[PDB]
């Protein structure tokens, strides 16, 4: 939360306490807490993080696995050429 | 002499003929139909608008091609074709086909439509 | 759960058994072996009568269905084609059929 917000590291240990600047762009990649539930119980806690950490990110991808069909022929065609 | 006569086997990959030689085997059964398709596969290549399996075509979901396959029959309304890779219903719901010889069940024959895998019917604009 | 990466590993045991071949192509035969092998490994993952009369389904079969229509249009082989997405039937067939009824 530190990180994400002040943009600063204060870092106090025994030896000197200092204070300097990192202002980095961050990127995280989680899973839902239990299987593919991702729409179906709530929208609310599928991750089970703090509530600040909402605020704190920018964007939220929801991503599901939709089956269809148009869809499957074009998976199947990008993934096979790609191995050629 | 029938009793008497030699066995020549197709190969689909080499397209020739092998030196083949009481009651037959069960492999044989499965091989029966199988040759005859292949023959018939051959003899397509050589009168040269192409050439695609049943599952191709239901693996897919959109369209547009001419069949080729056995004229079969499972369940009531439900008249099957087959060729060695799958099954797909087939239907004649207004279709004008064509003057042809005799167009009967255990047959081979082509016909032209759409898959349209939403109801899974695959429609016939004429039988040939 | 079928994802792509099941995709990924049929498609890789083709060039393991092509390995053996020491061979630098891959071929129509070679490969279809192993869509054997691993529907072998996945489907053991995945794996008005009737409706109204019985929705458990059991015991209402040939014998019973052959008895309630019985007490005109039903006829045994009749019965066996005209019966043949109730899966009900399908389900009865797996165990009611040698079940006797």
Redesign the interface.
């Known amino acids: 939360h530190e990180v994400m917000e002040q943009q600063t590291v204060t870092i106090a240990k025994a030896g000197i306490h200092t204070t300097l600047n990192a202002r980095c762009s961050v990127i995280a990649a989680a899973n839902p807490v239990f299987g ?1 539930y991702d729409v179906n119980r709530d929208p609310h806690q599928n991750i089970a993080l703090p509530d600040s950490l909402l605020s704190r990110f920018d964007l939220l991808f929801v991503v599901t ?1 939709d089956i269809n ?2 869809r499957d ?1 074009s ?2 065609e990008h ?1 096979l050429r790609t ?1 050629r | 002499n029938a009793s008497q006569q030699q066995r020549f086997s197709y190969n689909p990959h080499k397209m020739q003929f092998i030196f083949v030689p009481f009651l037959p085997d069960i492999e044989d059964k499965v091989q029966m139909f199988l040759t005859r398709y292949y023959l018939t596969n051959d003899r397509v290549m050589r009168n040269e608008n192409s050439i695609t399996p049943i599952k191709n075509l239901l ?4 369209q547009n091609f001419l069949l080729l396959g056995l004229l079969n029959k499972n369940f009531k309304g439900n008249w099957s074709l087959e060729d060695p890779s799958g099954s797909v219903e087939i239907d004649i719901s207004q279709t004008i086909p064509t003057q042809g010889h005799y167009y009967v069940p255990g047959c081979m024959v082509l016909v032209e439509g759409i898959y349209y ?1 939403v109801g899974n019917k695959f429609h016939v604009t004429s039988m040939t | ?1 079928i ?2 990466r099941q ?2 590993a049929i ?1 890789r045991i083709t060039e393991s058994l092509a390995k053996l071949e020491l061979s630098p192509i891959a071929q129509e035969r070679h490969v279809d072996e192993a869509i054997r092998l691993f529907q072998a490994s996945t489907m053991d993952a995945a794996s008005q009568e009737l409706k109204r009369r019985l929705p458990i389904g059991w015991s209402t079969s040939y014998q019973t269905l052959r008895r309630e229509f019985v007490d005109h249009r039903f006829s045994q082989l009749a019965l066996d084609k005209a019966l043949y997405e109730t899966i009900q039937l399908r389900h009865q067939g797996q165990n009611i059929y040698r079940s006797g009824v």
Request: charged letters at 30%; glycine letters at 4%; proline letters at 5%.
């Open positions: 593919q696995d069909e148009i022929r998976i199947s993934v191995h | 693996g897919r979901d959109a895998s | 759960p994802t792509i995709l990924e498609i």
